[PDB]
Design an enzyme around this catalytic site. Structure first.
Site, PDB file in Angstrom:
ATOM      1  N   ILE A  86     -15.991  48.950 -22.088  1.00  0.00           N
ATOM      2  CA  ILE A  86     -14.831  48.083 -21.990  1.00  0.00           C
ATOM      3  C   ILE A  86     -14.689  47.277 -23.297  1.00  0.00           C
ATOM      4  O   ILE A  86     -15.656  47.121 -24.030  1.00  0.00           O
ATOM      5  CB  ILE A  86     -14.988  47.111 -20.815  1.00  0.00           C
ATOM      6  N   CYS A  87     -13.481  46.803 -23.581  1.00  0.00           N
ATOM      7  CA  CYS A  87     -13.234  45.903 -24.686  1.00  0.00           C
ATOM      8  C   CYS A  87     -12.859  44.565 -24.099  1.00  0.00           C
ATOM      9  O   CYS A  87     -11.691  44.271 -23.889  1.00  0.00           O
ATOM     10  CB  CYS A  87     -12.104  46.433 -25.576  1.00  0.00           C
ATOM     11  N   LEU A  88     -13.871  43.766 -23.821  1.00  0.00           N
ATOM     12  CA  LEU A  88     -13.691  42.489 -23.175  1.00  0.00           C
ATOM     13  C   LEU A  88     -13.518  41.414 -24.233  1.00  0.00           C
ATOM     14  O   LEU A  88     -14.476  41.078 -24.940  1.00  0.00           O
ATOM     15  CB  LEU A  88     -14.873  42.214 -22.222  1.00  0.00           C
ATOM     16  N   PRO A  89     -12.280  40.877 -24.366  1.00  0.00           N
ATOM     17  CA  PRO A  89     -11.969  39.960 -25.466  1.00  0.00           C
ATOM     18  C   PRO A  89     -12.992  38.815 -25.636  1.00  0.00           C
ATOM     19  O   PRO A  89     -13.407  38.526 -26.755  1.00  0.00           O
ATOM     20  CB  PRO A  89     -10.575  39.429 -25.090  1.00  0.00           C
TER      21      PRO A  89
ATOM     22  N   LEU B  69      -8.012  51.557 -23.079  1.00  0.00           N
ATOM     23  CA  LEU B  69      -8.971  52.527 -23.577  1.00  0.00           C
ATOM     24  C   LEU B  69      -8.544  53.934 -23.188  1.00  0.00           C
ATOM     25  O   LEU B  69      -8.899  54.908 -23.838  1.00  0.00           O
ATOM     26  CB  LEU B  69     -10.385  52.217 -23.071  1.00  0.00           C
TER      27      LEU B  69
END
Length: 150
Positions: free
Chosen positions: A83-86, A119
């Site tokens: 995941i790209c968790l800010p 994604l």
């Protein structure tokens, strides 16, 4: 790092949020945790999803890493569970950030898909163009691969 992390884990295990179950560290590695996420967004609400949280030696001065180990069909989780968790971006990461905030933000990520930076772009496209067909796909994948809901 271990000492800070154990304090954090200990607090989370005693006061867990409703969407996090079975929070535990690895057998001899206190810098890796496991937990079940219980999302509320349909059709994800039917199952739970195991995640791995890894803390670096430099923690809290560098962010933890989080991935799903349970397969999930979601535009903001890739097929390897990344995941790209800010909030844990190297860019956004602040050393005051606690893991309870990070898990809350992950809960948000799953419950509220972000079609703007996905994604899986084909899932984001589908979610927008035909949300019912998306829901059918996600439900099937959720029922097939999801962890039994506590």
């Amino acid at each position: 790092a271990s000492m800070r992390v154990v304090k954090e884990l200990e607090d989370l295990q005693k006061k867990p949020p409703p969407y996090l179950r079975n929070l535990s560290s690895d057998d001899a590695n206190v810098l890796v945790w496991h937990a079940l996420l219980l999302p509320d967004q349909p059709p994800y609400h039917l199952k739970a999803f195991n995640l791995r949280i890894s803390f670096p030696p430099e923690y809290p001065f560098k962010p933890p890493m989080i991935k799903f180990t349970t397969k999930i069909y979601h535009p903001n989780v890739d097929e390897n569970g990344q995941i790209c968790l800010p909030i844990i971006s190297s860019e956004n990461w602040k050393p005051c950030t606690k893991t309870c905030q990070v898990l809350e933000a992950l809960n948000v990520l799953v419950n509220r898909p972000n079609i703007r930076e996905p994604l899986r772009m084909d899932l984001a496209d589908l979610l927008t163009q035909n949300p019912e067909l998306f829901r059918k796909n996600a439900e099937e994948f959720t029922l097939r691969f999801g962890v039994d809901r506590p």
